[model samples]
Target: GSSGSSGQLKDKFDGRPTKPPPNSYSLYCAELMANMKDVPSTERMVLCSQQWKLLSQKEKDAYHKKCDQKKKDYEVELLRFLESLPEEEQQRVLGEEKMLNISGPSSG
Candidate 1:
């Protein structure tokens, strides 16, 4: 159910699915979701509670910078694992065509 080429299940973005990543956009959304989950709920609540106040700008900016750093760390780790794989193996693992386009660019 959680597999598709456009990169994720539509039901997820539509809120019909409990989980996502069955489609492409879902992958991005899932990554962000996972990252967000890494933070404690209290932190998230605090962030959410202060996101709108002018006085909270510095705090929000700092939190965002930290999150960005964490995201970069995740990418580095993930890329390291991917880069460690054999080229063929990597292609094989991530090479499946996930969608069928009927009216896409013509071959000719």
Candidate 2:
């Protein structure tokens, strides 16, 4: 069996291992989606957007605080995992990432 690009090693730390913290807007949207399950997807989105816009600054701020805390926790764990990798693996992963970014997305 032919293995394509053995040089391209698997990423040990690609993307967040756990779900990243959702921002305040995302929290609201998730709740809104759950409550609006009977509604059409497009209509639900409009309703959610409208409702989000109408929320008071204080109300939105509470969710934002929760999101910020979660993000901090996620970053701590992410850093610990990255530091666990050997220097060579880290460099290879970073180099591959840079190359991918430069090439941009494929049409297919």
Candidate 3:
């Protein structure tokens, strides 16, 4: 059974670098799918550190800057996509009203 698990993990991570066990993306996606959640900032920062640490100093600077730009672009594109949705569905996805409801909840 352990052998089968390793094989499955290897298949999921075949395209990625060896570190992070390659299966990190599969694990991230699994969590997102299970909870409709976004990846946490701490994990993103850890991945950034890993990427930076693996490159040369010059390469690290350039790569980090590029990754930062890409992240900004991704956020903009994500916002645009959400904006394109119909109002009801957009509200549901954004949780705009629900967020307000939670802000006033009792602690006890």
Candidate 4:
């Protein structure tokens, strides 16, 4: 057998919440990227950029209706995400504070 790993190991389950869909610009552009994967990054992004601009105000805001709703639901899911973990780990994943402290460097 391989070098002794844990007797009980999970196949999968990373501790992040389900991905919320991107906002209007990003969500639309993601569809653009999905089909057209083989292209220059800036070049293709320009295509997405231009098309987003071309949309009428009503058309662009149409996407926001869906995205905004998803955004609210994403918040709901995130609280549920923290609730899944114990209080101790929630302190760790009070992630912004933890990262903010850890990220600063002393004089180097």
Clashes of 3: 0
Query: What would the TM-scores of all predictions be?
Result: 0.36, 0.56, 0.34, 0.60
Give model 2's TM-score versus the native structure.
0.56
Candidate 1 per-residue C-alpha lDDT over 5-79 given as tens digits, one digit per residue, 9 for 90 to 100 = 476545433311122123333233334445577667666555443433443556445555554565555445545
Clashing residue pair totals per candidate (backbone < 3 A): 9, 0, 0, 0
| Runs with alpha carbons beyond 4 Å of true place in candidate 4 | 1-13, 37-40, 97-108
Candidate 1, residue 47: the lDDT equals: 49
Query: Could you report the Cα RMSD, in angstroms, for every candidate shown?
Result: 12.9, 10.2, 14.2, 8.7
Residues 10-80, candidate 2, lDDT per residue (tens digit)?
55335433434458888777668889989888888888799899989998898788777766766676556
Error of 1 at 57 (Å): 0.4
Which lDDT tens digits does candidate 3 get at residues 1-108?
Answer: 465543563553332112221233333333334443354656655554555456576754554454455455544554666577778766774675224433455667
Instruction: Evaluate model 2: give its lDDT.
Output: 0.68
Worst 10 residues of 3 by lDDT: 13-22
Off by over 4 Å in 1: 1-55, 92-108
> How far does residue 89 in candidate 4 sit from its true spot (Å)?
1.2
Q: In candidate 1, residue 49 scores what lDDT?
A: 38
Give the runs in model 3 whose Cα sits over 4 Å from its true position: 1-54, 95-108
With candidate 1 superimposed using the best TM-score fit, by how many Å does residue 25's alpha carbon deviate from the native? 19
TM-score, ranked from best to worst: 4, 2, 1, 3
